[PDB]
Amino acid sequence: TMVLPGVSYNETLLTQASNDDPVTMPLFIGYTPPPVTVMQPVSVGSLTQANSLFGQRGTLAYSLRHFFENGGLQCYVLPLGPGKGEPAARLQELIAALQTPQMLETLLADDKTGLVLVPELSELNEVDADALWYQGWQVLLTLCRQAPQRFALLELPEDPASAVTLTQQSFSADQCQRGAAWWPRLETSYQDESSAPVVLSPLPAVAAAIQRSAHDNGVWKAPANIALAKTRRPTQSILTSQALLDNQGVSCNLIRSFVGKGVRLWGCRTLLNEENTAWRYIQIRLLVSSVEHYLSKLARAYLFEPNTAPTWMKLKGQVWTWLRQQWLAGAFFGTVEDEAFSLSIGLDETMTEDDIRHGKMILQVRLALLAPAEFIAISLTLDLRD
Amino acid sequence: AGRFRDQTLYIPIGQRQPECYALQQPDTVIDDQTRAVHQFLLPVDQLLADGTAELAQ
Amino acid sequence: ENALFPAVKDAIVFDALWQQAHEKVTALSGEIWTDTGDHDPGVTLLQSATWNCS
Amino acid sequence: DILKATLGQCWAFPPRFSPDTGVSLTAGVEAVMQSLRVLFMTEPGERIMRESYGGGMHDFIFENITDELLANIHNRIEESILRHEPRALLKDVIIQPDKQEASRLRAQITVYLANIHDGQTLRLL
Amino acid sequence: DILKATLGQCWAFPPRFSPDTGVSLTAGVEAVMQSLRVLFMTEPGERIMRESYGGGMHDFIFENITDELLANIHNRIEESILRHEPRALLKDVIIQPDKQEASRLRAQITVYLANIHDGQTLRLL
Amino acid sequence: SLLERGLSKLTLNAWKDREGKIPAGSMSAMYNPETIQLDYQTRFDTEDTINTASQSNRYVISEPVGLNLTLLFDSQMPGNTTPIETQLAMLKSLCAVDAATGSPYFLRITWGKMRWENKGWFAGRARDLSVTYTLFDRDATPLRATVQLSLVADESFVIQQSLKTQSAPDRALVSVPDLASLPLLALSAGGVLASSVDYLSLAWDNDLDNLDDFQTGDFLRATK
């Protein structure tokens, strides 16, 4: 009478809680779509939550739809405000907002994400464009250098000799180490409210391929050889623009399409164009920072302990156990343990008595990592035999 | 009543071929013998195109 | 649809055309162009031209 | 001369054309080696109406040399010589990473044209 | 346009009639979702000469969320999509009690149109 | 788990017809089996062909999935007050020939979260049953049972027809990728239907103009 218990119908979202994986968590830093707080990062769960917060049409809204339809697990969005309009002015207030010291108080006091991404620098293609591109990268490459474990996801402009002049620009070695560019911008299958297709940056498709091939295969594998789901084609192929093959700038990653298989990510190699330093190869930078994230989790468990020799060996025994299990899981190179990793805490091994009295506890880890199979050098031998 | 499902589309033989011979960019990277098969395929391409051209007239 | 397609569907489907071309080159040459596998280049060129003819 | 007769004659894999000599032709034992470069440089789907034909080595390009990979390369080579080139057996295929400038896998494929070593006991304990 | 062709056209579930436009019609992918609201809002016996047709969710209305219930809801949904709606697969159905103002079961039914996660070892002991 | 810690027993529902229209009795059995077992088996026969080109073996019939399951009843412990003959008057009845029609009862075994062969229930009829009473009383009320059930697969015809239309329902609706071709689009349409869809029929059914008409994102309908 008072109540009628029965079967209803509604489209509310139940949601899911905590996907962890802080190292491969993307962070989208576009402008708010036209009641989230103007600065705090917002946990976006499924694609239903991305529409219930941010609508369906925009620039950040299509990048979230292209994130979860490429196999993304969870994303965070850092809003910035209801931007102006006249998009040559939104896109120099975007860079000016990212240079504020209030960006550092939100990225350093975050500890939930690990892939910095601004997908709205793709709008610079419409639009000095070169000046805006270089202080678009270099602002992102310093927010990650400063932060303990963040990786930038960058992109090149479509026009060659504007993407050539960006790679032939000065970036310090410390900064290159942590950030990557994928060149060909993606033509999606989303309508633009008319017959014409929506062209998005490749980077929401990349950040979904990074954290699903780190969830499925492990973060040590590679982010490449991944079929991009809901893309028609990359807007430009490498057979029509032989620029960017000039070996005089930062390493770039190519997104291509094949015949028997679709649009593939076809590279994993950081902005370091150095042949011997193993801080190229994205999965090397993301594996060793996934070991930073856990070994510093059990290090600060033994933090406000005495500096006596028992607590040094309580810490080696826990780190040696964990590193041996990851070697037997396939994460490190080496057919014996002596060439896979090493630990060396001690009083006259790493520390000294002056280091102990200042309250330090210094532990050394050496690692041996795996190399990709980027080139297959087939040979044929006849072997006559009568 | 008419329909007009007609065309002007033609696909040359050289891009039927797999990606170890050609489709390399024009007169920049090929080396005067990878252009020799371009000229080998030119009369065959236009003899295949004349059927399309006569068909559309 | 006066269209010829159910009438000629067993003559334009690239296996009939390829065996007509393959027997033709087997007849014209035949002790000069002896290997006809899918690994000779001229075989691939001719069968691609056959696909465009179909 | 008889190897040129029994093993067929066909064109060269980079098609070289001249007005003096019409088509350059590889024959005999060189024709079997020419077909093996065709197989592993082709990829399945790249030949129209022949989609089975291909080596398929683009499956292994970002795959971590971890020795699950080197067994997959050994089986893909051995199978594709069975299916598409039964004119040449297989002896052994040895795959090594390049020691200088790594992340290059080098495979030596040895073909044919188609005892327990008792001496080691005198050099052990 | 082809989804409107392959998936049939039918009327809307609340019958909306106008003198300007005769009957409002749901077509294509929206027609499959319209039929799924019909199935779980119907109850077996409520359609004359069609007594098999119904979702049957009135069986579960005073039943204590104790997780014997949530398996019975999962099987009643999965079976009734098999029997009465084979135009749409089933992906997963997730049932949660409502945290604010409890004694409401919320089921999200996800359909289709019709690997062991190795990364977790680096975040465990 | 995830809400509470009460047990979920197994329930043996019975019908009379192949479908679920006519319900017979339905019991839930205490003291869960500890172990189930469902055995699949497929019979093959070797081709003794004279031509000796190939070695192969045909597919003849797939034997029905059989389920083995062992129960136990007991009524003398002071929580157990229902006599076990009232609980065995249903297993002996439902796993035997019914008086109405002269057939078995088309049982359906179910457990709270256990998913049988690919469904949430296990249909079928009882091949075997053996009760072996081991303890008694002075007047011999039994009060210890040890039942040894064994069933077969036998699903209904409406469920088996519904699972067939969920795989290749005689239309494909194949999307085209970038850098596509009709021999590849026929292999991707011949895998949705498993019927070798012979590319010249694709360009005729979809009104293609020149065998390369699709443009990287449009769909092609393939029937049979």
In SS3 terms, chain A reads as: CCCCCCCCCCCCCCCCCCCCCHHHCEEECCCCCCCCCCCCCEEECCHHHHHHHHCCCCCHHHHHHHHHCCCCCCEEECCCCCCCCCCCCHHHHHHHHHCCHHHHHHHCCCCCCCEEECHHHHHHCCCCHHHHHHHHHHHHHHHHHHCCCCEEEEECCCCCCCCHHHHCCCCCHHHHCCEEEECCCEEEEEECCCCCEEEECCHHHHHHHHHHCCCCCCCCCCCCCCECCCEEEECCCCCCCCCCCCCCCCCCEEEEECCCCCEEEECCCCCCCCCCCCCCCHHHHHHHHHHHHHHHHHHHHHCCCCCCHHHHHHHHHHHHHHHHHHHCCCCCCCCCHHHCEEECCCCCCCCCHHHHHCCCCCCCEEECCCCCCCEEEEEEECCCCC
CA distance A176 to A189: 33
Partner residue opposite F162 with nearest CB, options E3, E67, E82: E82
Query: How far is residue F93 from each of residues A197, F14, F82, F88, F148, measured CA to CA in Å?
Result: 67, 10, 18, 8, 15
DSSP annotation of E6: H
Which residues have C-beta within 8 Å of that of residue A259, sequence separation ≥ 6? B19, D43, D45, D46, F179, F180, F181, F184
Which chain C residue is nearest to residue F203, measuring alpha carbons?
C5
Q: Are residues A138 and A159 in the same domain?
A: yes
Task: Give D-chain residues touching F183 at CB under 8 angstroms.
Answer: 48-49, 51
Continuous H helices in D1-125: 2-6, 29-41, 69-84
What does the longest C-alpha to C-alpha distance in chain B come to? 53
Smallest CA-to-CA distance from A140 within A110, A90, A112, A104 is with: A104
Q: Is residue A9 part of a domain?
A: no
Q: How many domains does chain A have?
A: 2
State whether residue E110 sits within 8 Å of chain A by CB.
Answer: no
Cβ proximity of A352 and D80 under 8 Å? no
Q: Is the dihedral of CA F203, F208, F209, F212 positive or negative?
A: negative
Cβ proximity of A271 and A251 under 8 Å? yes
Smallest CA-to-CA distance from A182 within A162, A153, A208 is with: A153
Cβ proximity of A341 and A327 under 8 Å? yes
Cβ proximity of F94 and F107 under 8 Å? yes
Terminal Cα-to-Cα distance of chain F (whole angstroms): 46
Long-range own/partner contacts, residues A339-345 (CB < 8 A, 24 or more apart): A339/A368, A340/A367, A340/A368, A341/A365, A341/A366, A341/A367, A341/A368, A342/A366, A343/A316, A343/A319, A345/A312, A345/A313, A345/A315, A345/A316
φ, ψ of residue D84 to 5 degrees: the values are -110, 0
Q: Are residues A96 and A142 in the same domain?
A: yes
Smallest CA-to-CA distance from A104 within A75, A82, A81, A78 is with: A78
Which of B3, B4, B6, B9 has the highest number of chain F CBs within 10 A, making it the mutation to test binding with F?
Answer: B9
CA distance D13 to C38: 11
CA distance D26 to D14: 11
Q: Are residues A47 and A188 in the same domain?
A: yes
Q: Is residue A377 part of a domain?
A: no
SS3 of residue D70 by DSSP:
helix
CA distance C28 to E78: 66
Cβ proximity of E70 and E95 under 8 Å? yes
CA distance A362 to A352: 10
Q: Are residues A124 and A159 in the same domain?
A: yes
Cβ proximity of A360 and A334 under 8 Å? no
**How many A/F residue pairs have CB atoms within 8 Å?**
20
SS3 of residue F206 by DSSP:
coil
DSSP annotation of C36: -
Q: Using only C-alpha atoms, what is the Rg of chain B? A: 15
Which residues have C-beta within 8 Å of that of residue A201, sequence separation ≥ 6? A63, A119, A121, A122, A155, A185, A186
- Token digits of residue D81: 């010589």
Partner residue opposite A14 with nearest CB, options E57, E106, E118: E106
Task: Give B-chain residues touching A160 at CB under 8 angstroms.
Answer: none
How many alpha carbons fall within 13 Å on the CB side of residue C42? 22
Neighbour tally for F183: CB within 10 Å? 18
CA distance D94 to A380: 11
State whether residue B46 sits within 8 Å of chain C by CB.
Answer: no
Query: How far is residue A282 from each of residues A22, A66, F159, measured CA to CA in Å?
Result: 16, 22, 50
Q: Are residues A358 and A252 in the same domain?
A: no
Q: Which residues of A103-121 are buried (b: 16+ CB within 10 A; e: fewer)?
A: beebbeebeebbbbbbbbb
3-state helix, strand, coil in chain D (%, to 5): 35, 20, 45
Last residue of a domain, one of A280, A303, A328: A280
CA distance A281 to A196: 36
Cβ proximity of E26 and E34 under 8 Å? yes
CA distance F217 to A262: 12
**How many D/F residue pairs have CB atoms within 8 Å?**
7
Q: A50: burial class by Cβ within 10 Å (0-12, 13-18, 19+)?
A: buried
CA distance F202 to F190: 11
Task: Give F-chain residues touching B17 at CB under 8 angstroms.
Answer: none
**How many C/F residue pairs have CB atoms within 8 Å?**
7
Residue F222 distance to chain C (closest CA, Å): 18
Q: Do chains E and C touch (3 or more CB pairs under 8 A)?
A: no
Q: Is residue A121 part of a domain?
A: yes
Cβ proximity of E79 and F120 under 8 Å? yes
3-state helix, strand, coil in chain E (%, to 5): 35, 20, 50
Last residue of a domain, one of A280, A306, A336: A280
State whether residue E2 sits within 8 Å of chain F by CB.
Answer: yes
Which residues have C-beta within 8 Å of that of residue A43, sequence separation ≥ 6? A74, A76
DSSP E strands in chain F: the ranges are 10-15, 23-29, 36-46, 57-69, 107-110, 122-124, 126-128, 150-151, 174-175, 219-220
Which element (helix H / strand E) includes E70?
A: helix E69-84
Q: Which residues pair with D9 in a beta bridge?
A: D27
Q: Do chains C and D touch (3 or more CB pairs under 8 A)?
A: yes
Q: Are residues A248 and A339 in the same domain?
A: no
State whether residue A189 sits within 8 Å of chain F by CB.
Answer: yes
Q: Is residue A384 part of a domain?
A: no
The coordinates were experimentally obtained by cryo-EM
Cβ proximity of A271 and A152 under 8 Å? no
CA distance B22 to C44: 13
CA distance A230 to A186: 10
Task: Give C-chain residues touching B16 at CB under 8 angstroms.
Answer: 48, 51-52
Which residues have C-beta within 8 Å of that of residue A312, sequence separation ≥ 6? A345, A346, A347, A361
CA distance D108 to D78: 13
Residue E86 distance to chain F (closest CA, Å): 6
Which of D32, D49, D53, D62 has the highest number of chain A CBs within 10 A, making it the mutation to test binding with A?
Answer: D62
Contact F163 E82 (CB under 8 A): yes
Residue B5 distance to chain C (closest CA, Å): 13
Which chain A residue is nearest to residue F217, measuring alpha carbons?
A232
CA distance A19 to E95: 19
- Token digits of residue D40: 């592993």
Q: What angle do CA F83, F85, F91 make, to 5 degrees?
A: 130
Q: To one decimal place, what's the resolution in Å?
A: 3.1
Task: Give B-chain residues touching D41 at CB under 8 angstroms.
Answer: 18, 20
- Give residue A68's domain range: 19-280
Cβ proximity of A272 and A280 under 8 Å? yes
